[PDB]
Coordinates of N, CA and C and ligand atoms in Angstrom, one line a residue:
Chain A
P1 N 101.9 97.8 73.9 CA 101.0 98.9 74.1 C 101.3 99.4 75.5
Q2 N 100.5 100.4 75.9 CA 100.5 101.0 77.3 C 99.7 100.2 78.3
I3 N 100.2 100.1 79.5 CA 99.6 99.3 80.6 C 99.6 100.2 81.9
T4 N 98.4 100.4 82.4 CA 98.2 101.1 83.7 C 98.5 100.1 84.9
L5 N 98.6 100.6 86.1 CA 99.0 99.8 87.2 C 97.9 99.7 88.3
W6 N 96.7 100.0 87.9 CA 95.5 99.8 88.8 C 95.3 98.3 89.1
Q7 N 95.7 97.5 88.2 CA 95.7 96.0 88.4 C 97.2 95.5 88.2
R8 N 97.5 94.3 88.7 CA 98.8 93.7 88.4 C 99.0 93.6 86.9
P9 N 100.2 94.0 86.4 CA 100.5 93.8 84.9 C 100.9 92.4 84.5
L10 N 99.9 91.5 84.5 CA 100.2 90.2 84.1 C 100.1 90.0 82.6
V11 N 101.0 89.3 82.0 CA 101.0 89.0 80.6 C 101.0 87.4 80.3
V12 N 100.6 87.0 79.2 CA 100.7 85.6 78.8 C 102.1 85.4 78.2
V13 N 102.8 84.4 78.7 CA 104.1 84.0 78.1 C 104.1 82.5 77.7
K14 N 104.9 82.3 76.6 CA 105.2 80.9 76.2 C 106.7 80.7 76.5
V15 N 107.0 79.6 77.2 CA 108.3 79.3 77.6 C 108.3 77.8 78.1
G16 N 109.3 77.0 77.5 CA 109.8 77.2 76.2 C 108.8 76.6 75.2
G17 N 108.1 75.5 75.7 CA 106.9 75.0 74.9 C 105.6 75.0 75.7
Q18 N 105.6 75.7 76.8 CA 104.5 75.8 77.7 C 103.9 77.2 77.9
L19 N 102.6 77.3 78.2 CA 102.0 78.6 78.4 C 101.8 78.9 79.9
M20 N 102.2 80.2 80.3 CA 102.2 80.6 81.7 C 101.7 82.0 81.7
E21 N 101.3 82.5 82.9 CA 101.1 83.9 83.1 C 102.2 84.4 84.0
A22 N 102.6 85.7 83.8 CA 103.7 86.3 84.5 C 103.5 87.8 84.7
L23 N 104.2 88.2 85.7 CA 104.2 89.6 86.1 C 105.3 90.4 85.5
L24 N 104.9 91.5 84.7 CA 105.9 92.4 84.2 C 106.4 93.2 85.4
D25 N 107.6 93.0 85.8 CA 108.1 93.4 87.1 C 109.4 94.2 87.0
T26 N 109.3 95.5 87.1 CA 110.4 96.4 87.0 C 111.4 96.4 88.2
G27 N 110.9 95.9 89.3 CA 111.8 95.7 90.4 C 112.6 94.4 90.4
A28 N 112.5 93.6 89.4 CA 113.3 92.3 89.3 C 114.4 92.5 88.3
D29 N 115.6 92.2 88.7 CA 116.7 92.2 87.7 C 116.6 91.0 86.7
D30 N 116.0 89.9 87.3 CA 116.0 88.6 86.6 C 114.6 88.1 86.4
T31 N 114.5 87.1 85.5 CA 113.2 86.5 85.2 C 113.2 85.2 85.9
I32 N 112.1 85.0 86.7 CA 112.0 83.7 87.5 C 110.6 83.1 87.3
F33 N 110.5 81.8 87.1 CA 109.3 81.1 87.0 C 109.3 79.9 88.0
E34 N 108.1 79.6 88.4 CA 107.8 78.4 89.2 C 108.4 77.1 88.6
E35 N 108.5 76.1 89.4 CA 109.1 74.8 88.9 C 108.4 74.4 87.6
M36 N 109.2 74.2 86.6 CA 108.8 73.6 85.3 C 110.0 73.0 84.7
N37 N 109.8 72.1 83.7 CA 111.0 71.4 83.2 C 111.5 72.1 82.0
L38 N 112.6 72.9 82.2 CA 113.3 73.4 81.1 C 114.4 72.3 80.7
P39 N 114.6 72.2 79.4 CA 115.6 71.1 79.0 C 117.1 71.6 79.2
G40 N 118.0 70.6 79.3 CA 119.4 70.9 79.3 C 120.1 71.2 80.6
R41 N 121.3 71.8 80.5 CA 122.1 72.1 81.6 C 121.7 73.5 82.3
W42 N 121.9 73.5 83.6 CA 121.6 74.7 84.4 C 122.7 74.9 85.5
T43 N 122.9 76.1 85.9 CA 123.8 76.5 87.0 C 123.0 76.9 88.2
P44 N 123.5 76.5 89.5 CA 122.8 76.9 90.7 C 123.0 78.4 91.0
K45 N 121.9 79.0 91.4 CA 121.9 80.5 91.7 C 121.0 80.7 93.0
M46 N 121.5 81.6 93.9 CA 120.7 82.0 95.0 C 120.3 83.5 94.7
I47 N 119.1 83.8 95.1 CA 118.5 85.1 94.9 C 117.8 85.4 96.2
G48 N 117.6 86.7 96.6 CA 116.9 87.1 97.7 C 116.0 88.2 97.4
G49 N 114.8 88.2 98.1 CA 113.9 89.4 98.1 C 113.2 89.5 99.4
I50 N 112.1 90.1 99.3 CA 111.2 90.2 100.5 C 110.7 88.8 101.0
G51 N 110.9 88.7 102.4 CA 110.6 87.5 103.1 C 111.7 86.4 103.0
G52 N 112.8 86.7 102.5 CA 113.9 85.7 102.5 C 114.5 85.3 101.1
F53 N 115.0 84.1 101.0 CA 115.8 83.7 99.9 C 115.5 82.3 99.4
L54 N 115.7 82.0 98.1 CA 115.5 80.7 97.5 C 116.8 80.2 96.7
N55 N 116.8 78.9 96.5 CA 117.8 78.3 95.6 C 117.1 78.0 94.3
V56 N 117.7 78.6 93.2 CA 117.1 78.6 91.9 C 118.1 78.0 91.0
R57 N 117.6 77.5 89.8 CA 118.4 77.0 88.7 C 118.4 78.0 87.6
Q58 N 119.6 78.4 87.1 CA 119.7 79.3 86.0 C 119.9 78.6 84.7
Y59 N 118.9 79.0 83.8 CA 119.0 78.4 82.4 C 119.2 79.6 81.5
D60 N 120.2 79.4 80.7 CA 120.6 80.5 79.7 C 120.0 80.2 78.4
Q61 N 119.8 81.3 77.6 CA 119.3 81.3 76.3 C 118.1 80.5 76.0
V62 N 117.1 80.7 76.9 CA 115.8 80.1 76.8 C 114.9 81.0 75.9
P63 N 114.3 80.4 74.9 CA 113.3 81.0 74.1 C 112.1 81.4 75.0
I64 N 111.7 82.7 74.9 CA 110.5 83.2 75.5 C 109.7 84.1 74.6
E65 N 108.4 83.9 74.6 CA 107.5 84.5 73.8 C 106.5 85.4 74.6
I66 N 106.6 86.7 74.4 CA 105.8 87.6 75.3 C 105.1 88.6 74.4
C67 N 103.8 88.5 74.4 CA 102.9 89.2 73.5 C 103.3 88.7 72.1
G68 N 103.7 89.7 71.2 CA 104.2 89.2 69.9 C 105.7 89.1 69.8
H69 N 106.4 89.3 70.9 CA 107.9 89.4 70.9 C 108.5 88.1 71.2
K70 N 109.4 87.6 70.4 CA 110.2 86.5 70.7 C 111.6 87.0 71.1
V71 N 112.1 86.5 72.3 CA 113.4 86.8 72.7 C 114.0 85.5 73.2
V72 N 115.3 85.6 73.5 CA 116.1 84.5 74.0 C 116.8 85.0 75.2
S73 N 116.6 84.4 76.4 CA 116.9 85.1 77.6 C 117.3 84.0 78.7
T74 N 118.1 84.5 79.7 CA 118.3 83.8 80.9 C 117.0 83.7 81.8
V75 N 116.7 82.5 82.3 CA 115.5 82.3 83.0 C 115.9 81.4 84.2
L76 N 115.5 81.9 85.4 CA 115.7 81.2 86.7 C 114.4 80.3 87.0
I77 N 114.6 79.1 87.4 CA 113.5 78.3 87.9 C 113.7 78.0 89.3
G78 N 112.7 78.3 90.1 CA 112.7 78.1 91.6 C 111.4 78.5 92.2
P79 N 111.2 78.3 93.5 CA 110.0 78.7 94.2 C 109.8 80.2 94.1
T80 N 108.8 80.6 93.5 CA 108.4 82.0 93.5 C 106.9 81.8 93.5
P81 N 106.2 82.7 94.2 CA 104.7 82.4 94.4 C 104.0 83.0 93.1
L82 N 104.7 83.5 92.1 CA 104.2 84.2 91.0 C 105.3 84.2 90.0
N83 N 105.0 84.0 88.7 CA 106.0 84.1 87.7 C 106.4 85.5 87.4
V84 N 107.7 85.8 87.3 CA 108.1 87.2 87.2 C 108.9 87.4 85.9
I85 N 108.5 88.4 85.2 CA 109.3 88.9 84.0 C 110.2 90.1 84.4
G86 N 111.5 89.9 84.4 CA 112.4 90.9 85.0 C 113.0 91.8 83.9
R87 N 113.8 92.8 84.3 CA 114.4 93.8 83.4 C 115.2 93.1 82.3
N88 N 115.8 92.0 82.6 CA 116.6 91.3 81.5 C 115.8 91.0 80.2
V89 N 114.5 90.7 80.4 CA 113.6 90.4 79.3 C 112.9 91.7 78.8
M90 N 112.5 92.5 79.8 CA 111.8 93.8 79.4 C 112.6 94.7 78.6
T91 N 113.9 94.9 78.8 CA 114.7 95.7 78.0 C 114.6 95.2 76.5
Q92 N 114.6 93.9 76.3 CA 114.6 93.3 75.0 C 113.3 93.5 74.2
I93 N 112.2 93.7 74.9 CA 111.0 94.1 74.3 C 110.8 95.6 74.2
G94 N 111.7 96.3 74.7 CA 111.7 97.8 74.7 C 110.8 98.4 75.7
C95 N 110.4 97.7 76.7 CA 109.5 98.1 77.8 C 110.1 99.3 78.6
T96 N 109.3 100.3 78.8 CA 109.7 101.5 79.6 C 108.7 101.9 80.7
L97 N 109.1 102.7 81.7 CA 108.1 103.3 82.6 C 107.9 104.7 82.2
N98 N 106.7 105.2 82.4 CA 106.3 106.6 81.9 C 105.4 107.2 82.9
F99 N 105.6 108.5 83.3 CA 104.6 109.3 84.0 C 104.9 110.8 83.8
Chain B
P1 N 108.1 111.6 82.8 CA 109.3 111.3 82.1 C 109.4 109.8 81.8
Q2 N 110.1 109.4 80.8 CA 110.3 108.0 80.4 C 111.5 107.4 81.0
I3 N 111.4 106.2 81.5 CA 112.5 105.5 82.2 C 112.8 104.2 81.5
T4 N 114.0 104.0 81.0 CA 114.4 102.7 80.5 C 114.8 101.7 81.6
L5 N 114.9 100.5 81.3 CA 115.1 99.4 82.3 C 116.4 98.7 82.1
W6 N 117.4 99.3 81.4 CA 118.8 98.8 81.4 C 119.4 98.9 82.7
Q7 N 119.0 99.8 83.6 CA 119.4 100.0 84.9 C 118.2 99.9 85.8
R8 N 118.4 99.7 87.1 CA 117.3 99.7 88.1 C 116.6 101.0 88.1
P9 N 115.3 101.0 88.1 CA 114.6 102.3 88.2 C 114.5 102.9 89.6
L10 N 115.6 103.4 90.1 CA 115.6 104.1 91.4 C 115.2 105.5 91.2
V11 N 114.4 106.0 92.2 CA 114.1 107.4 92.4 C 114.4 107.9 93.8
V12 N 114.6 109.2 93.9 CA 114.7 109.8 95.2 C 113.3 110.0 95.8
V13 N 113.1 109.6 97.1 CA 111.9 109.8 97.8 C 112.0 110.5 99.1
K14 N 111.1 111.4 99.3 CA 110.9 112.0 100.7 C 109.7 111.3 101.4
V15 N 110.0 110.7 102.5 CA 109.0 110.0 103.3 C 109.3 110.2 104.7
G16 N 108.3 110.6 105.5 CA 108.5 110.8 107.0 C 109.5 111.8 107.3
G17 N 109.6 112.9 106.5 CA 110.7 113.9 106.7 C 112.1 113.5 106.4
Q18 N 112.2 112.3 105.8 CA 113.6 111.7 105.5 C 113.7 111.5 104.1
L19 N 115.0 111.5 103.6 CA 115.2 111.3 102.2 C 115.8 109.9 102.0
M20 N 115.4 109.2 101.0 CA 115.9 107.9 100.6 C 115.8 107.6 99.1
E21 N 116.3 106.5 98.7 CA 116.1 106.0 97.4 C 115.2 104.7 97.4
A22 N 114.5 104.6 96.3 CA 113.6 103.5 96.2 C 113.4 103.1 94.7
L23 N 113.1 101.8 94.6 CA 112.8 101.2 93.3 C 111.4 101.4 92.8
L24 N 111.2 101.9 91.6 CA 109.8 101.9 91.0 C 109.5 100.4 90.6
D25 N 108.6 99.8 91.3 CA 108.5 98.4 91.2 C 107.1 97.9 90.8
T26 N 106.9 97.6 89.5 CA 105.6 97.3 89.0 C 105.1 95.9 89.6
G27 N 106.0 95.1 90.1 CA 105.7 93.8 90.6 C 105.3 93.8 92.1
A28 N 105.1 95.0 92.7 CA 104.8 95.1 94.1 C 103.4 95.8 94.2
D29 N 102.5 95.2 95.0 CA 101.2 95.8 95.1 C 101.3 97.0 96.1
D30 N 102.2 96.8 97.0 CA 102.3 97.8 98.2 C 103.7 98.4 98.2
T31 N 103.9 99.5 99.0 CA 105.1 100.3 99.1 C 105.7 99.9 100.4
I32 N 107.0 99.5 100.3 CA 107.7 99.1 101.5 C 109.1 99.6 101.6
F33 N 109.4 100.2 102.8 CA 110.7 100.7 103.1 C 111.3 100.0 104.3
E34 N 112.7 100.0 104.3 CA 113.5 99.6 105.4 C 113.1 100.4 106.7
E35 N 113.4 99.7 107.9 CA 113.0 100.2 109.2 C 113.3 101.7 109.2
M36 N 112.3 102.5 109.5 CA 112.5 103.9 109.8 C 111.3 104.3 110.8
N37 N 111.5 105.4 111.5 CA 110.5 105.8 112.4 C 109.4 106.6 111.6
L38 N 108.3 105.9 111.4 CA 107.1 106.7 110.9 C 106.3 107.0 112.2
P39 N 105.8 108.2 112.3 CA 105.1 108.6 113.5 C 103.8 107.9 113.6
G40 N 103.3 107.6 114.8 CA 101.9 107.2 115.1 C 101.6 105.7 115.1
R41 N 100.3 105.5 115.1 CA 99.7 104.1 115.1 C 100.1 103.4 113.8
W42 N 100.1 102.0 113.9 CA 100.3 101.1 112.7 C 99.6 99.8 112.9
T43 N 99.4 99.0 111.9 CA 98.8 97.7 112.0 C 99.8 96.7 111.6
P44 N 99.9 95.5 112.3 CA 100.7 94.4 111.8 C 100.3 93.9 110.5
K45 N 101.2 93.7 109.6 CA 100.8 93.1 108.3 C 101.7 91.9 107.9
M46 N 101.1 90.9 107.2 CA 101.8 89.8 106.6 C 101.9 90.4 105.2
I47 N 103.1 90.6 104.7 CA 103.5 90.1 103.4 C 104.4 88.9 103.0
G48 N 104.1 88.4 101.8 CA 104.9 87.3 101.2 C 105.6 87.8 99.9
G49 N 106.9 87.6 99.9 CA 107.6 88.0 98.7 C 108.2 86.7 98.2
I50 N 109.1 86.9 97.3 CA 109.8 85.7 96.7 C 110.1 84.7 97.7
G51 N 110.5 85.1 98.9 CA 110.9 84.2 100.0 C 110.0 84.2 101.2
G52 N 109.2 85.3 101.4 CA 108.2 85.5 102.4 C 107.3 84.3 102.7
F53 N 106.6 84.2 103.8 CA 106.0 85.4 104.5 C 106.7 86.0 105.7
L54 N 106.4 87.3 105.9 CA 107.2 88.2 106.8 C 106.3 89.2 107.6
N55 N 107.0 90.0 108.5 CA 106.3 90.9 109.4 C 106.6 92.3 109.3
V56 N 105.5 93.1 109.0 CA 105.7 94.5 108.6 C 104.7 95.3 109.4
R57 N 105.0 96.6 109.5 CA 104.1 97.5 110.1 C 103.4 98.3 109.0
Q58 N 102.1 98.4 109.1 CA 101.4 99.2 108.1 C 101.0 100.6 108.6
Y59 N 101.5 101.6 108.0 CA 101.2 103.0 108.3 C 100.3 103.5 107.1
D60 N 99.1 104.0 107.5 CA 98.2 104.6 106.6 C 98.4 106.1 106.5
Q61 N 98.1 106.6 105.3 CA 98.1 108.0 104.9 C 99.4 108.7 105.3
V62 N 100.5 108.2 104.8 CA 101.8 108.8 104.9 C 102.1 109.7 103.7
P63 N 102.5 110.9 104.0 CA 103.1 111.8 102.9 C 104.3 111.2 102.2
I64 N 104.2 111.2 100.9 CA 105.4 110.8 100.1 C 105.6 111.7 98.9
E65 N 106.8 112.2 98.8 CA 107.2 113.0 97.6 C 108.2 112.2 96.7
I66 N 107.8 112.1 95.4 CA 108.5 111.4 94.4 C 108.5 112.2 93.1
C67 N 109.6 112.5 92.6 CA 109.7 113.2 91.2 C 108.7 114.4 91.1
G68 N 108.7 115.2 92.1 CA 107.8 116.4 92.2 C 106.5 116.2 92.8
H69 N 106.0 114.9 92.6 CA 104.6 114.6 93.0 C 104.5 114.3 94.5
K70 N 103.5 115.0 95.1 CA 103.2 114.7 96.5 C 102.0 113.8 96.6
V71 N 102.1 112.6 97.2 CA 101.0 111.7 97.4 C 100.9 111.4 98.9
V72 N 99.7 110.9 99.3 CA 99.5 110.4 100.6 C 99.0 109.0 100.5
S73 N 99.8 108.1 101.1 CA 99.7 106.7 100.8 C 100.0 105.8 102.0
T74 N 99.5 104.5 101.9 CA 99.8 103.4 102.8 C 101.3 103.0 102.5
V75 N 102.0 102.9 103.6 CA 103.4 102.6 103.5 C 103.7 101.5 104.6
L76 N 104.3 100.4 104.1 CA 104.8 99.4 105.0 C 106.2 99.6 105.4
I77 N 106.5 99.3 106.7 CA 107.8 99.3 107.2 C 108.2 97.9 107.6
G78 N 109.4 97.4 107.2 CA 109.8 96.1 107.5 C 111.2 95.8 106.8
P79 N 111.8 94.6 107.1 CA 113.2 94.4 106.7 C 113.4 93.9 105.2
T80 N 113.0 94.8 104.3 CA 113.3 94.6 102.9 C 114.7 95.0 102.5
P81 N 115.3 94.4 101.4 CA 116.7 94.7 101.1 C 116.9 95.9 100.1
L82 N 115.8 96.3 99.5 CA 115.7 97.6 98.8 C 114.3 98.2 99.1
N83 N 114.3 99.5 99.2 CA 113.0 100.2 99.4 C 112.2 100.1 98.1
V84 N 110.9 99.8 98.2 CA 110.1 99.5 97.0 C 108.9 100.5 96.9
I85 N 108.8 101.1 95.8 CA 107.6 101.9 95.5 C 106.6 101.1 94.7
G86 N 105.5 100.8 95.3 CA 104.5 99.8 94.7 C 103.5 100.4 93.9
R87 N 102.5 99.6 93.4 CA 101.5 100.1 92.5 C 100.6 101.1 93.2
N88 N 100.4 100.9 94.5 CA 99.5 101.8 95.2 C 100.0 103.2 95.2
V89 N 101.3 103.4 95.1 CA 101.8 104.8 94.9 C 101.9 105.2 93.4
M90 N 102.3 104.2 92.6 CA 102.6 104.5 91.2 C 101.4 104.9 90.4
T91 N 100.2 104.3 90.7 CA 99.0 104.7 90.1 C 98.7 106.2 90.4
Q92 N 99.0 106.7 91.6 CA 98.7 108.0 92.0 C 99.5 109.0 91.2
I93 N 100.8 108.7 90.9 CA 101.6 109.6 90.1 C 101.4 109.4 88.6
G94 N 100.6 108.4 88.2 CA 100.2 108.2 86.8 C 101.2 107.4 86.0
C95 N 102.0 106.5 86.7 CA 103.0 105.7 86.1 C 102.4 104.5 85.3
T96 N 102.9 104.4 84.0 CA 102.4 103.3 83.1 C 103.6 102.5 82.6
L97 N 103.4 101.3 82.2 CA 104.3 100.5 81.4 C 104.0 100.7 79.9
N98 N 105.0 100.7 79.0 CA 104.8 101.0 77.6 C 105.8 100.1 76.8
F99 N 105.3 99.5 75.7 CA 106.2 98.8 74.7 C 105.6 98.5 73.4
Ligands
017_101 C1 111.5 93.0 96.5 C2 112.1 93.5 95.2 C3 113.3 94.4 95.5 C4 112.6 92.3 94.3 N1 111.4 91.4 94.1 C5 110.6 91.7 92.9 C6 109.3 92.4 93.5 O1 108.6 93.1 92.4 C7 108.4 91.3 94.1 C8 107.8 90.4 93.1 C9 106.9 89.4 93.7 C10 105.5 89.6 93.6 C11 104.6 88.7 94.2 C12 105.1 87.6 94.9 C13 106.5 87.4 95.0 C14 107.4 88.3 94.4 N2 107.3 92.0 94.7 C15 107.1 92.2 96.1 O2 107.9 91.7 96.9 O3 105.9 92.9 96.5 C16 105.5 92.8 97.8 C17 104.9 94.2 98.1 O4 103.6 94.2 97.5 C18 103.1 92.9 97.5 O5 102.6 92.5 96.2 C19 103.1 91.2 95.8 C20 104.1 90.8 96.9 C21 104.2 91.9 97.9 S1 111.9 89.8 94.2 O6 110.8 89.0 93.6 O7 112.0 89.5 95.6 C22 113.3 89.4 93.5 C23 114.4 89.3 94.3 C24 115.6 89.0 93.7 C25 115.8 88.8 92.3 N3 117.0 88.5 91.8 C26 114.6 88.9 91.5 C27 113.4 89.3 92.1

């Protein structure tokens, strides 16, 4: 559906077997969540934004469930003060900006 | 106009009599640009980003032109790696998420 921006655009997500809230975030190329146990192998990744940079772990082809949409996506795990749904996932649910 | 998210949602902005590019950023509460001279008084502000917390100058009631739209908004100046158009500006121009 359509979402205004008077409040933060938080949505409920399931990943991979856990429930989280995350921010629909058009300024993020990538999807990043707080420390949680994703299963399997990961590759080290550094990313930077406002206030500096973190070391994150990149998990590929992680099932994510967002609203009614199931997708399989790359997911970074590392310190973020908020879970963020990035363009890599939003494109897959057909999310656009409009004004 | 509708904007897909296959690419970063950059827009051209006029702010403080200067032209720049910025990201339409639904994950940002506030609007923040790289160091530039905005005229007048300002307040020190803490933000925290992915890597934050950090030191920024808050300028109130700054003229901003984006996509035809002229708004007057709070604008933060500080060492961000991309200029960011936050929800405080996006709501004024009527920007929504859709899917
Ligand atoms: C700064 C952007 C260019 C990129 N950021 C996404 C952005 O939407 C963050 C996303 C974000 C949101 C909250 C907390 C941490 C990160 N928002 C943000 O920094 O907003 C700040 C300005 O307004 C305030 O509102 C919230 C924080 C403040 S980011 O989280 O740092 C980021 C950086 C690198 C990658 N690869 C992916 C994401």
